[PDB]
């Protein structure tokens, strides 16, 4: 009964939309950083207030907001095929 409500409160976090993946290309100023969508449009947006550009760097896989498109979170490395070529024994 309580764990079901926990999954309900889990779902109370899920209405928040997922951000858009991004690759920081380069930067211009502290409010302007060259970024492109995976579909090709290039943008310049502002960051969030926790980060330093040492946590970004140019040529970095990142994420942007869905409206303001602001730089928020990120991961440096991802890909589909790599580990799935490993598993033949």
């Amino acid at each position: 009964t309580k764990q079901y409500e926990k999954s309900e409160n889990d779902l109370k976090a899920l209405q928040s939309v997922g951000q858009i993946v991004g690759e920081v290309l380069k930067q211009l100023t502290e409010e302007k950083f060259i970024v492109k969508a995976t579909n090709g449009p290039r943008y310049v947006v502002g960051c969030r207030r926790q980060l330093d550009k040492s946590k970004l760097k140019p040529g970095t896989r990142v994420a942007l907001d869905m409206t303001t498109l602001t730089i928020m979170r990120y991961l440096p490395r991802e890909v589909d095929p790599l580990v799935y070529n490993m598993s033949h024994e």
């Binding site: 409010e31 449009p41 290039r42 943008y43 310049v44 947006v45 502002g46 498109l69 602001t70």
Partner: protein, 55 residues
Amino acid sequence: DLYSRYKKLQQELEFLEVQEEYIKDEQKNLKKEFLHAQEEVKRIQSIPLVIGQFL
């Protein structure tokens, strides 16, 4: 007649004088409104702005 029209010639003179200080204060306030319009066009627009391929 001479003194008559002589007393008639400072009417429009003082009227143009109060128009001077008027239009001065007018274009002073409208100037600050144009400076406000400069704050608009310099605020306009974005941040964030999509760059594009120019020909």
